[PDB]
Paper text:
Melanoma differentiation-associated gene 9 (MDA-9) is a small adaptor protein with tandem PDZ domains that promotes tumor progression and metastasis in various human cancers. MDA-9 contains four domains, the N-terminal (1–109aa), PDZ1 (110–193aa), PDZ2 (194–274aa), and the C-terminal (275–298aa). PDZ domains are small, globular PPI domains containing approximately 90 amino acids that form a classical two α-helices (α1, α2) and six β-strands (β1–β6) structure. Through the interactions between the PDZ domains and the substrates, MDA-9 tandem PDZ domains are involved in syndecan-mediated signaling to the cytoskeleton and perform a variety of physiological and cellular functions, e.g., cell–cell adhesion, trans-membrane trafficking, immune regulation, autophagy, ubiquitination, neural development, and exosome control.
Herein, we identified four hits—PI1A, PI1B, PI2A, and PI2B—targeting the PDZ1 and PDZ2 domains of MDA-9, using NMR chemical shift perturbation (CSP). PI1A and PI1B bound to the MDA-9 PDZ1 domain with an affinity of 0.11 and 0.34 mM, respectively, determined from the dose-dependent CSPs. The similar CSP patterns indicated that PI1A and PI1B bound to the same pocket of the MDA-9 PDZ1 domain. To gain insight into the binding details, we solved the crystal structure of the MDA-9 PDZ1 domain in complex with PI1B. The complex structure indicated that PI1B was bound in a typical substrate recognition groove between the α2 helix and β2 strand of the MDA-9 PDZ1 domain. This groove was mainly composed of the residues K124, I125, G126, L127, R128, Q142, H175, and L178. PI1B formed two hydrogen bonds with the backbone of Ile125 and Gly126, and residue G126 was also a conserved residue for binding to the substrate peptide. Notably, the side chains of residues Q142, R128, and K124 were rearranged upon ligand binding, relative to the free form. The cell counting kit-8 (CCK8) assay suggested that PI1A, PI1B, and PI2A were not toxic, while the wound-healing assays demonstrated that PI1A or PI2A alone suppressed the migration of MDA-MB-231 cells. Accordingly, the combination of PI1A and PI2A inhibited migration more effectively than the treatment of a single inhibitor, and PI1B also demonstrated a similar synergetic effect with PI2A.
Author numbering:
A (entry chain A), B (entry chain A): -1 to 79
The structure:
């Protein structure tokens, strides 16, 4: 099911999340232990549907991480399945 | 109506929010310009119903700010009316 998660960057600007583009989607490839990403329950294999309001269908892995990096207000919003 | 807001501390650990205890409730007394608080649309007079899962009914102004300070994971959750 659809779910929104809100991640706050840690004190070094990081969230602890690696993403993979595949099958026209964006998926969670690696979640760092004890991180903003693990705090909201992200897991290997989760699909990311939106990042900061934008549909990620057809984004590259590097685009998805760029948009993560460009987060506004120390805050990353994502829609997940 | 009920609403949840999620605030991410800025890079100096701050959120830009002053709260007042009155009439058995917690209300927004001051919102700093260009802050985590203004980013989520908080306004003078808003009522804070919950902070980080806890009902704030009957909290002191100093308790409410303490709980703000004790935020977990660089993240403040609030329920607002
Ligand atoms: C607890 C360790 C945190 C490192 C983690 C992170 O915060 N970013 C990360 C860094 C800046 C913005 C968004 C995420 N990336 C990352 C992974 C792959 C490619 C690029 C960045 C990471 O692996
Ligand atoms: C853009 C300026 C930010 C200052 C603002 C803030 O982040 N906290 C604040 C500081 C630490 C934790 C939570 C909030 N308080 C504050 C107000 C009244 C009493 C105590 C703290 C503030 O006024």
């Amino acid at each position: 099911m659809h779910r929104e998660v809100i991640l706050c960057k840690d004190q070094d600007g990081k969230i602890g999340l690696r993403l993979k583009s595949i099958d026209n989607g964006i998926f969670v490839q690696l979640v760092q232990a004890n991180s903003p990403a693990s705090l909201v329950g992200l897991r290997f294999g989760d699909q990311v549907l939106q990042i900061n309001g934008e549909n990620c269908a057809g984004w590259s892995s590097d685009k998805a991480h760029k948009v993560l990096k460009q987060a506004f207000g120390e805050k990353i919003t994502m829609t997940i399945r």
